[PDB]
Symmetry: D2
């Protein structure tokens, strides 16, 4: 169809004032003309879309989620069942999460940890309109990290499951890259980091620091025992390669140091720079990130979500309060360039059942809720009700080099948009009320989504 | 309807001399009339089917298996994934379990330990010929023996798998019966054995003594603790109820104590009969058994498999090794009334895979191979091949009281039998070489089984 | 020199009204003459005691304790270090606990589970006067149970400690009995049971039920499984052999059966009586105990300490409230027959530091404060102050057959007794105030006790 | 004093043609003269010692040892008992081991991981002649590794004992260092290092890669997973302070990086240099090392032990074979320095008892054979018993800057020397020939050692 959406009150999300009396046309995919005129106008064959009493915000863009849920895998009881159920139809399961986002208005997602052949499949099944879902740029595995049954993720179950299964699934995820590279000389690293890269992942996440946490973490004490995965020399050896392909660089930082190094490594996208596992980002580095110009994603929680979570002693609750949010504001109020990151996904129905109602009410990490929560809380961090959005908008997409394409709302750009019911401003939570989601200049049947309920099957 | 045989050389299945040049005829399941007159009638319209060069042996009746394969449950691992994928298809995974008894010749099966619902629904489905398999009378669960994920079975996996999942399944097996009742005053236990009987188990199997033996196993002091779950006045209570509902009473016994205990009640069948855990059976017993009217189940391993388990140190080898055989035989060579008992069921294609190729060839614990294994080994413990197949066929029937229904090939009994190229009387193992298999006056398509494959699907 | 005590108020604690203005006269230990008169005079050349405005109570006797901490163990952790450090000095740890017992006024103590080598020798040491301490009786191991580093106790550490140490330190306990005993023929048990009793244990405590409730560790839950360690022929096979040596048979029973069987052998002392684990003893059984001639050892906790533990949720908090306190009133309300049973001991210096001060204060299971607490709660359950007083003194002696020697100020009997400022009758907590402690005629120096501080030495 | 030990064939341990027909004068430690002459002659008034038929070597110095024997603490079981029992006598336990070193000829011992207060006390005591042991130098703990109940050491351990004893003991090592250093900025990592030396540990060791053999405990997959405890700037900052103090800095490296990072920094000693954890030092790195001028300690085994080890199931067996071994070979022959390195000490009598008799004879990690086994296996890998004999002496001396004090019988040097009844140059193995041992000029009574035995005391 060729469509005209009329009488929209438009948030470009660029940061400009919202403008009412705005009428947007779509050509093909592709936004066409943006102006009010009275209209613009309509080419008589153009499909009508009535935009009275609604808003257009650019289609939401999530910079961090895992289409197959690693927060659970990291979480981790229930990793084994969810992998064994759903094995071999994973690629359709990945497309499940991709839909839940889009259903909630996220047109495009960046996934930083997954199984590469199913997540590439998914990225291929979705773009070609074989499979309904959100546009996915595949991160691949995160380099230097082991499988779902390794450490880095839930470690027991190495002993509770058949060895042949436990390794089987790992090799899917780990591919030829990953954590054994610790030991070995960069020569062979260099070798195996482009054989991998040649696989078509959009991006590279270089795991600069350890993923061993729930495994080691202490039952009274909070965090400790951060480590550093790779040699400082070995670390450029993958940045050179990453630079060579044209994929940008994403980085796992978990400690004040290794964040520093990640900033010195010139990494395009910093994934959870706010979790420094410790002291707040030394008031030094903020003015290096800010100064040395690479984008910074923060992952957040409400106070109200936290207030509950320590009330129930969630132990994933420590991350919410405590030096971590008292640390982001500095970057916010220092105008660090900010990204939408909630490590996220679509968990097994049983793992929701274990959590307290307090805990799974409005859970940030659940892929439908995540971008709303994040946009709601960030303001709680001293952020105007805009930018907030984009925020999710341009800033995740400015930070990958997808900015010219997504999105949007501007002429000659992919037409991905969401229509709201109510003012996004003073109440940032209105992003939830969505009369329509358009993608690639196309309508989404939101009412019936997902296309095939799989991981939402109970019983 | 019709079908008959010519000039077959049959073992009457009572250990009577095989009479060659002999013939069966049979109309509409159960056998019509047998013996040659060197005219055995053909009343025309009749299936001319050749019996030369092959033998007529009654169908195998395996008096212990586990259609959900509970053996794999007391660990190894690989239960967690197994129960997860397959949950809600359970009836099918079992029926496939049942079929692989038919292919390898077992025409009838009693399941000592299962979940009542999908095993009864598997039986209720077969019995109606709604599906293919070996006739099941299904004890349901065992009384006093609880969750697949508790102790008794896969103890690790409370912590590896979510509580919802574990709690959901644990209830699937326990019924109203199970672990607790160790606690209940017995007259209220009376309620909950009885609620259980009315459900439709064809029999009742109480666990006189623990299953904790295998979680922990442990540490290679190759024996050392047993316990007992109920008090005798509860046993004598439990058997009373088992009597009036008309069901056979079966008994799990793992200690020198607890067999004398098991027999006194009047249990018809003693599963795990030879397993005394660190001890040879007392003559005082070898007498209590031989004199007092009860059947002993025995489970055994090859002499070329025995030293395989010992070699790779399989931690199953404690059973193969040491006092079980000298304890086995002393029941055979005291002339006890024994039974074909092998715990078994389909294992994870993976749980198979972790195993050594030694453990894999000749494996006792598969549903297909286990009777071939059993009859073979049992002669190696000093049986008479003709008599051991009595253990395979009539003996199991007479235990549960099924002799008038199944067993030996006599007149008026269910028409179930097997035709073999080589000779059982010469070599019992050559009960393997089958050409035709018939259950209920019906040929079985020997290639189709298991129809819908799940656990077997390779890869 | 013939201790002679004038003007006191004597609680005979046979229940009778305390008689003031009374002097009891001691001739070389073994009290000779209680008096009315006014005094029934002070023969001559006797030592001087000053009794007016003070109360003499019988020197308390303890119907269960653990000198080597058993309690703590079950625990769990803190056993690997405590038993490791004090190895071979064990024998002095025993007396040290009974150095702690005496100074608060416990003049006699019955230990149930302990290590014969240390437990018995220490008593031989104490009685003949080599070491200061409170008289010891000592069942040795509980036949039917293992030791500290197995199940029944601190399971863990098996895999965290040395196999050589592991095996060495149980089998200090286990002796000939406990693991094994379950396996063997009754015939071989009664040889081993007879053999062990030969070592002069004063008692036979047999574990009628299991001691593993702590693999039954669980939260969101409470205990479900209990087992009965031996068959009935073995349990009464033993009680024969205890009858041989003329020793009392004590029973360990945590199920509603089990306790019932304990009853059916006529066990002289029921240890753990009120603990049937999650069930309430039916009044048929409350009646079975009261009619059948045997004693109910009753373990207790503060209504406050319950309210104390219930808050910080001590992992032992479940026996404090719950069906376990609520019944036992049942046993006493019905004139049950009573005995002062407090599993108790002297924990490692650390074992206390791991405890919330709401548990380090007024702890029931610390051998110092152990009896004071038990009496205080027994009045709350519904005892007349004296009869709790009678039952913390003579009953326990009368249960085991010691009322020939200890427990009442009736003459002939051992001179154990205690003097306090305050009247226990109008507050039984005012038993707490000790002025003098006299054992076997002799005064106790309560200032320097324990003589050599070991476990009380910090650090 | 004037000690003169005469007509010995002297090896000053410089790698020359040995010096037969010699007499060396000791005047008050600190050798006065050396020349064959006839003697030189003797100054009388003097201890003339029989030098008949015997050699003189300066006596060994071990450049890697733990006097709490932390090779067991990863083992780990049997860590707890050891630390639990000896505590408070820890100071005597350290001195305990230093005597077995002196008993076997090690005249000076370098201690690379321990608790400060005990070891600096033990050190300071031996120097002060207030106790008898091999002189101590003692790096203190190794920075970046936490207590022995943490990762890097005994697991499980930590959850199987009190949290106080775990916390008290842990802290005692960590000294302010290890673990958290991970958490905190280079700027306050720096300051926290400055405080540490303040007590004067005599060198600095810093773990460039992690101690976690036992977060990976898979036979089969085996060795994978390595980490670095510090980013390069933190190693940098740590390194200079170590210079500002003038303590030799030593490196713990287990990856092909680390090692390549450790030479980059210029840690004098690289400990664990031949351990690539699964990879063989690259050419270019071995010829990087030789230019680099740092001293390489290699931990070596007999081929005799390695077959023995591997024929057990010995968990170190990998460490003997593979490149782990095949590496020292490629390092010795590049004309690269070698340092005498064995982590070693005295394990508890129970730690040894578990192992096969194969494993406990000639055990490299035991402070009795530790050097001997080591020395022999250098000549087995291509050293010259002239250069291997010294590899235990002048290198370890030269490595720490003690070179003008220890390692050769030479200019104004403390008299440490040991007298052999055999020729070491002929068979190295002949370093087991000792007759007497002289430390600081004085003889020590060698069957009198250890003076007080704690760990040794069997049983």
């Amino acid at each position: 169809s060729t469509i005209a959406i009329t009488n929209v009150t438009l948030i470009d999300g660029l940061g400009g004032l919202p403008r009412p009396a705005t009428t947007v046309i779509v050509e093909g995919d592709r936004f066409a003309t943006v102006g009010p005129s009275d209209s613009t106008p309509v080419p008589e064959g153009a499909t009508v879309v009535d935009g009275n009493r609604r808003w257009m915000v650019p289609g939401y863009v999530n910079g961090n989620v895992h289409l197959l849920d690693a927060w659970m895998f990291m979480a981790g009881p229930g990793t084994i069942e969810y992998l064994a159920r759903w094995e071999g139809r994973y690629v359709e399961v990945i497309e499940e999460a991709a839909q839940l986002a889009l259903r909630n208005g996220v047109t495009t997602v960046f996934d930083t940890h997954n199984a590469i052949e199913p997540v590439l499949a998914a990225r291929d099944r979705i773009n070609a309109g074989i499979s309904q879902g959100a546009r996915i740029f595949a991160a691949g595995t995160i380099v230097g990290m082991g499988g779902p049954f390794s450490a880095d993720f839930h470690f027991a179950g190495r002993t509770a499951a058949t060895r042949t299964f436990v390794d089987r699934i790992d090799s899917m995820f780990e591919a030829g890259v990953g954590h054994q590279l610790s030991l070995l000389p960069r020569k062979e690293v260099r070798a195996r980091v482009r054989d991998y890269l040649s696989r078509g992942v959009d991006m590279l996440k270089i795991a600069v620091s350890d993923h061993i946490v729930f495994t080691l973490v202490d039952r009274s004490v909070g965090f400790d025992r951060s480590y550093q995965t790779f040699s400082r020399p070995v670390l450029e050896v993958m940045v050179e390669e990453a630079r060579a392909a044209g994929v940008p660089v994403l980085t796992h930082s978990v400690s004040v140091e290794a964040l520093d190094t990640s900033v010195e490594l010139g990494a395009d996208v910093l994934i959870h720079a706010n979790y420094t596992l410790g002291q707040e980002i030394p008031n030094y580095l903020i003015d290096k990130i800010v100064a040395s110009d690479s984008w910074a994603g923060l992952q957040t929680v409400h106070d109200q979500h936290r207030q509950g979570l320590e009330d129930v002693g969630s132990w994933a609750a420590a991350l919410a309060g405590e030096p971590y949010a008292t640390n982001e504001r500095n970057l916010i109020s220092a105008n660090a360039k900010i990204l939408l990151n909630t490590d996220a996904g679509c968990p097994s129905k049983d793992h929701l059942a274990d959590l307290s109602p307090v805990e799974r009410e409005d859970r940030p990490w659940t892929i439908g809720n995540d971008h709303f929560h994040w946009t709601q809380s960030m303001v709680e961090k001293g952020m105007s009700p805009l930018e907030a959005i984009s925020a999710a908008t341009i800033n995740v997409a400015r930070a990958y080099g997808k900015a010219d394409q997504i999105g949007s709302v501007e002429t000659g750009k992919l037409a991905d948009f969401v229509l709201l019911d109510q003012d996004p401003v003073d109440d940032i939570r209105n992003l939830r009320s969505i009369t329509e989601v358009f993608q690639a200049g196309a309508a989404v049947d939101r009412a019936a989504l997902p296309t095939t309920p799989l991981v939402t099957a109970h019983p």
